[PDB]
């Protein structure tokens, strides 16, 4: 047999992402002294499109606390932040849309996004267009916070891990049906060459576990174990249950 | 050309007559070599590795 | 018109001419002759006659 399509995706070469037109790594500020003790005041100089990202970017300029320089930080925009708005990032900052507050300082039920997963990194949760996380609860004795993630999962993260207030903006994007294949082509022209995606069962048996046969059929159960080796994982991987849900499945 | 190759070879010892004779001999020898090469190549120069032969076999 | 060793450039050609022949040169143009050798067009100033200089060197 041959190395299958998903296998040879890890090697890179043609499958790397197309990063030419991107504005940079969209990340919050570094957790410095000012931002971890009080707050600092940036100005949203411009809001720009970023190829391959569904949400706009906000270029917030801050004064360097330790030199003359002005540092430009690229935030993921929040619905309602507009050019010329003053952004207050830090613990002492007040609770207004677009600001950056450590989760310890925001009351229960606050809606945040672009949440620092562990204090010190620069944003890791609720970053895609129109997504958000909900501050479920607080544990002040343990410096922990329960939050609800876009997937529906609860997570406990350090209450000193920051997150921007509001929603990621650019929402409702996936409701508009791409009609032309060219729409998807131009969508994935700026994303890592994932498309078009040849069905496995059309491939010949040397190319894919489903391939081959006088009829296009998988012939063996498509649910693949977690413990199956790489090159066997094609189809429904470690599936708990297949088929139509036919249930509420919660909201 | 105040001095020509004809003069620079007449000093060297090949007159015009001898130069013509020798050039004719060289031309003839080279043409004989080409004849021999064509003879010996024609037998096996047509041997193609992957000729497809539309009406296969 | 001179043949010039390929390692030479316009300044070295200018200095050599001013040295070997007591003449002043207006400008120097050079090319790599197709047989692999530098060829230099050395133009003297208006107060020297190349025709006199050439026959002084010894070629007519």
């Amino acid at each position: 047999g041959r190395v299958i399509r998903n296998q040879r995706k890890g090697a890179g070469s043609i499958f790397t992402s197309h990063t030419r037109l991107r504005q940079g790594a969209a990340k919050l500020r570094t957790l410095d002294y000012a931002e971890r003790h009080g707050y600092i005041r940036g100005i949203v100089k411009q809001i720009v499109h970023d190829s391959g990202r569904g949400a706009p970017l906000a270029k917030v300029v801050f004064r360097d606390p330790y030199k003359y320089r002005l540092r430009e930080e690229i935030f993921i925009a929040n619905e309602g932040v507009h050019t010329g708005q003053f952004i207050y990032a830090g613990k002492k900052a007040s609770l207004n849309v677009g600001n950056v507050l450590p989760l310890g300082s925001v009351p229960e039920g606050t809606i945040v996004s672009n949440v620092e997963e562990k204090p010190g990194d620069r944003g890791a949760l609720a970053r895609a267009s129109g997504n958000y996380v909900i501050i479920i609860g607080h544990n002040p004795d343990e410096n922990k916070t329960r939050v609800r993630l876009p997937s529906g999962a609860k997570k406990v993260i350090s209450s000193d891990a920051r997150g921007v207030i509001g929603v990621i903006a650019g929402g409702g994007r996936v409701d508009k049906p791409l009609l032309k294949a060219g729409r998807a082509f131009h969508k994935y022209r700026l994303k890592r060459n994932s498309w078009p995606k040849t069905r496995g069962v059309a491939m010949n048996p040397v190319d894919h576990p489903h391939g081959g046969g006088n009829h296009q059929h998988i012939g063996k159960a498509s649910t693949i174990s977690r413990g199956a080796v790489s090159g066997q994982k094609a189809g429904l991987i470690a599936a708990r249950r297949t088929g139509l849900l036919r249930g509420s499945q919660k909201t | 050309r105040t001095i020509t190759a004809a003069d620079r070879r007449m000093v060297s010892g090949v007159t015009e007559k001898q130069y013509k004779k020798g050039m004719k001999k060289m031309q003839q020898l080279e043409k004989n070599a080409i004849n021999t090469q064509i003879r010996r190549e024609i037998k096996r120069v047509n041997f193609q590795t992957h000729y497809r032969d539309e009406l296969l076999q | 018109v001179f043949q010039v060793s390929m390692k030479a450039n316009k300044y070295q050609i200018k200095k050599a001419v001013k040295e070997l022949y007591e003449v002043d040169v207006l400008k120097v143009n050079t090319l790599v002759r197709p047989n692999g050798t530098k060829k230099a067009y050395v133009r003297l100033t208006a107060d020297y006659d190349a025709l006199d200089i050439a026959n002084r060197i010894g070629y007519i």
Binding site: - | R9, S12, M26 | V32, P34
Partner: protein, 50 residues
Amino acid sequence: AAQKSFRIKQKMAKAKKQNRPLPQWIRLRTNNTIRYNAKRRNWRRTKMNI
């Protein structure tokens, strides 16, 4: 090509220098074996392959 690297034009010049028949006076030497120039490259027949 029109824009040539200097190295390529050096090989160029080498071939032009080499492209000539035998010097005739060589044939008159004692124990002479050279009948003709056997390495006579020409542009119609064999490319320089550089």
